[PDB]
C-alpha cells in the first residue's frame, strides 16, 4: 500500500495473507468470507504470461495477522488449501475481466478478536454504496512504493471514481465487472494498492446497518500511486452468482 498508514489491531479481521511455501514469500492478499472460504483475485493464482500457476499445495493462508514477517504466536492461524476455484471466464489475455477466485480451507478456522469474516454485498448494498465519491478501504502488506516493505498491515481509504474517468485513464478495455478508485491529481490526497496487495479486499462500511462489506478485490493498475492513474477492482457483487454457485455446490 502506497501512501497509507499502519492499521490498528483487529481493524481488518477478515484480512488474509496468501503465503508461498517455497520460497517463503508474500504471494498476495485475500479475505475471509466464512470459516472455510477465502476470496482472492484469479491473477494471484493463475497468470500464464508470467508462468504463474499455483496448485493447492504451493501455498498457505495466514489469518489474523498484523506483522508482515513475524510468526504471530497465539494470534495468527495458518490454514491449508483443500481446493482452488477460479472463475471459468477469467480473462487473463485481455484485461483481467472476472478476476476472482475462491479457496476452500482444509479445516474450518476458529473466529477470534483478530479473525472474523467480512460480508458480501447483495444488489441493494451495491446500488447504495457503489457511487462515485464514496470511499472504500484497501488493506495489505504489499510494497510501500512503486520502485520498501512494511513492518505491519497498511490501510488506505480511497474514493470510487466516475466510470468515464476510469475509462479515459487507460488503454485497457474496462468492463462492468470492474470499478476503479483513487484520488485525482487535483484532489491533493494520494494512495493506492501495490505489488503484494492484490487479491486483497476493498471494503465499505454500510451506514445503514454498520457492517463491513467487501465491494471489490484489488485487481490491477499501471504502476502504483501514479498521478492520473487509478486502481482497478473486481466488482464483487457482479460476480456473486458465481460465488454462490461454487459455495452451494462444493
Amino acid at each position: 500500500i502506497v501512501e497509507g498508514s499502519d492499521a490498528e489491531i483487529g481493524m481488518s479481521p477478515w484480512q488474509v495473507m496468501l503465503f508461498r511455501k517455497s520460497p517463503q514469500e508474500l504471494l498476495c492478499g485475500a479475505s475471509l468470507i466464512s470459516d472455510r472460504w477465502v476470496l482472492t483475485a484469479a491473477h494471484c493464482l493463475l497468470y500464464p504470461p508470467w508462468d504463474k500457476n499455483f496448485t493447492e499445495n504451493d501455498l498457505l493462508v495466514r489469518i489474523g495477522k498484523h506483522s508482515r514477517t513475524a510468526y504471530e504466536r497465539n494470534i495468527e492461524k495458518i490454514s491449508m488449501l483443500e481446493k482452488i476455484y477460479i472463475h471459468p471466464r477469467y480473462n487473463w489475455r485481455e484485461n483481467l475481466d472476472r478476476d476472482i477466485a475462491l479457496m476452500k480451507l482444509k479445516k474450518p478456522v476458529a473466529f477470534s478478536d483478530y479473525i472474523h469474516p467480512v460480508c458480501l454485498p447483495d444488489r441493494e448494498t451495491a446500488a447504495s454504496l457503489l457511487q462515485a465519491g464514496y470511499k472504500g478501504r484497501v488493506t495489505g502488506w504489499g510494497n510501500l512504493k512503486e520502485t520498501g516493505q512494511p513492518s505491519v498491515l497498511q490501510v488506505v481509504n480511497l474514493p470510487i471514481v466516475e466510470r468515464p474517468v476510469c475509462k479515459d485513464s487507460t488503454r485497457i478495455r474496462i468492463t462492468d465487472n470492474m470499478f476503479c478508485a483513487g484520488y485525482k491529481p487535483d484532489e491533493g490526497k494520494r494512495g493506492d494498492a501495490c505489488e503484494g496487495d492484490s487479491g486483497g479486499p476493498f471494503v465499505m462500511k454500510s451506514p445503514f446497518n454498520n457492517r463491513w462489506y467487501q465491494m471489490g478485490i484489488v485487481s490491477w493498475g499501471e504502476g502504483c500511486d501514479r498521478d492520473g492513474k487509478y486502481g482497478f477492482y473486481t466488482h464483487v457483487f457482479r460476480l456473486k452468482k458465481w460465488i454462490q454457485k461454487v459455495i452451494d455446490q462444493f
Binding site: 498508514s5 490498528e8 489491531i9 483487529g10 481493524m11 479481521p13 468470507i33 473466529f111 477470534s112 478478536d113 483478530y114 472474523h116 469474516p117 467480512v118 460480508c119 458480501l120 454504496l129 465519491g133 464514496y134 470511499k135 472504500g136 478501504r137 490501510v155 481509504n157 474514493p159 465499505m204 462500511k205 454500510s206 451506514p207 454498520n210 457492517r211 463491513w212 462489506y213
Partner: peptide, 27 residues
C-alpha cells in the same frame, strides 16, 4: 449473521481512526 462486525470495534462500540472519513463520504 455476524459478518462484518469486528470484535474489537463494532462489537464493543469502538470506532477506528479513519472510519468516519468513509461515513462522511456517503452523502
Amino acid at each position: 449473521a455476524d459478518c462484518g462486525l469486528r470484535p474489537l470495534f463494532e462489537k464493543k462500540s469502538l470506532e477506528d481512526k479513519t472510519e468516519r472519513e468513509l461515513l462522511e463520504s456517503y452523502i
